[PDB]
Design an enzyme around this catalytic site. Structure first.
Site, short mmCIF file in Angstrom:
data_model
loop_
_atom_site.label_atom_id
_atom_site.label_comp_id
_atom_site.label_asym_id
_atom_site.label_seq_id
_atom_site.Cartn_x
_atom_site.Cartn_y
_atom_site.Cartn_z
N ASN A 124 0.85 -1.18 0.00
CA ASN A 124 0.00 0.00 0.00
C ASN A 124 0.88 1.23 0.00
O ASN A 124 1.80 1.35 0.82
CB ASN A 124 -0.94 0.02 1.20
CG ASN A 124 -1.97 1.13 1.10
OD1 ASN A 124 -2.54 1.37 0.04
ND2 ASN A 124 -2.19 1.82 2.21
N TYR B 145 -5.86 14.71 -2.27
CA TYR B 145 -5.69 14.04 -0.99
C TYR B 145 -4.94 14.94 -0.03
O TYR B 145 -3.96 15.60 -0.41
CB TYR B 145 -4.94 12.72 -1.21
CG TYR B 145 -4.44 12.04 0.04
CD1 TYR B 145 -5.27 11.19 0.77
CD2 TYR B 145 -3.13 12.21 0.48
CE1 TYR B 145 -4.81 10.55 1.91
CE2 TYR B 145 -2.67 11.58 1.61
CZ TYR B 145 -3.51 10.75 2.32
OH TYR B 145 -3.05 10.12 3.45
N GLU C 4 -8.41 12.95 7.55
CA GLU C 4 -7.85 12.56 6.26
C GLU C 4 -8.96 12.70 5.23
O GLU C 4 -10.01 12.07 5.37
CB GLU C 4 -7.32 11.13 6.31
CG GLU C 4 -6.50 10.72 5.10
CD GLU C 4 -5.99 9.29 5.20
OE1 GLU C 4 -6.67 8.46 5.83
OE2 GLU C 4 -4.91 9.01 4.64
N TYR D 34 -10.36 12.90 1.09
CA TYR D 34 -10.19 12.50 -0.30
C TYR D 34 -11.23 13.19 -1.16
O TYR D 34 -12.40 13.31 -0.75
CB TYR D 34 -10.34 10.98 -0.48
CG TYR D 34 -9.31 10.11 0.20
CD1 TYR D 34 -9.33 9.92 1.57
CD2 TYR D 34 -8.34 9.45 -0.55
CE1 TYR D 34 -8.39 9.11 2.19
CE2 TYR D 34 -7.40 8.64 0.06
CZ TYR D 34 -7.43 8.47 1.43
OH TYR D 34 -6.50 7.66 2.04
N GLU E 18 -2.96 6.53 -4.84
CA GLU E 18 -2.88 5.52 -3.80
C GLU E 18 -3.24 4.16 -4.38
O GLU E 18 -4.18 4.05 -5.18
CB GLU E 18 -3.81 5.86 -2.63
CG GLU E 18 -3.85 4.79 -1.54
CD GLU E 18 -4.72 5.18 -0.37
OE1 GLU E 18 -5.26 6.31 -0.37
OE2 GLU E 18 -4.87 4.36 0.56
#
Length: 190
Positions: A44, A77, A86, A88, A177
């Protein structure tokens, strides 16, 4: 120009490259706002270019190609401190809608499409201030694309109207990502 995991500045643009250390990712910084990611059976990772710190009414332009083979997103992001969030603004994803299984908190129209707004929670996951529990804000585009303009003020205001408040803005990048997948992408930020 492929680099290790880390952050910094390249050609006037802030960049942030990170991965879980599994391997298989190749992140490269290009000229100006260009950056390229090529990954095959990776772990990841999150990598891209943008601004440090970001702001709440910036207009972000991205262009290039984005071809995922598996789980991957292309998005605006960023993070916010106090509260730790966080966020997006997902423009395009691969085999997995990141909003799957999340509660829908409204919609917003911006830059030629309708976005659906969601909130998720990460419990004791890594973050920009260490391991924490924090909320994630999602603006998932319906009409996917790999280039165009993003007016973050539309999303940040829509999030605020629905009870999703951002604090002080941290870094704010156009990021690719990918979670245990393959693919390649070359994005130019401005």
């Amino acid at each position: 120009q492929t680099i290790q995991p880390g952050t910094g500045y390249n050609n006037g643009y802030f960049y942030s490259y990170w991965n879980d250390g599994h391997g298989g990712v190749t992140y490269t910084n290009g000229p100006g706002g260009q950056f390229s990611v090529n990954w095959s059976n990776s772990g990841n990772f999150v990598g891209g270019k943008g601004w440090q710190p970001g702001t709440k009414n910036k207009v972000i332009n991205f262009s290039g190609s984005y071809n995922p083979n598996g789980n991957s997103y292309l998005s605006v992001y960023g993070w916010s401190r106090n509260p730790l969030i966080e966020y997006y603004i997902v423009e395009n994803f691969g085999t997995y809608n990141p909003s799957t299984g999340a509660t829908k908190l409204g919609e917003v129209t911006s830059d030629g499409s309708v976005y659906d707004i969601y909130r998720t929670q990460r419990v004791n996951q890594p973050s920009i201030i260490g391991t924490a529990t924090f909320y994630q804000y999602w603006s998932v585009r319906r009409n996917h694309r790999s280039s165009g303009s993003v007016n973050t003020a539309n999303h940040f205001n829509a999030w605020a109207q629905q009870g999703l408040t951002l604090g002080t803005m941290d870094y704010q990048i156009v990021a690719v990502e990918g979670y245990f997948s393959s693919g390649s992408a070359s994005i130019t930020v401005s």
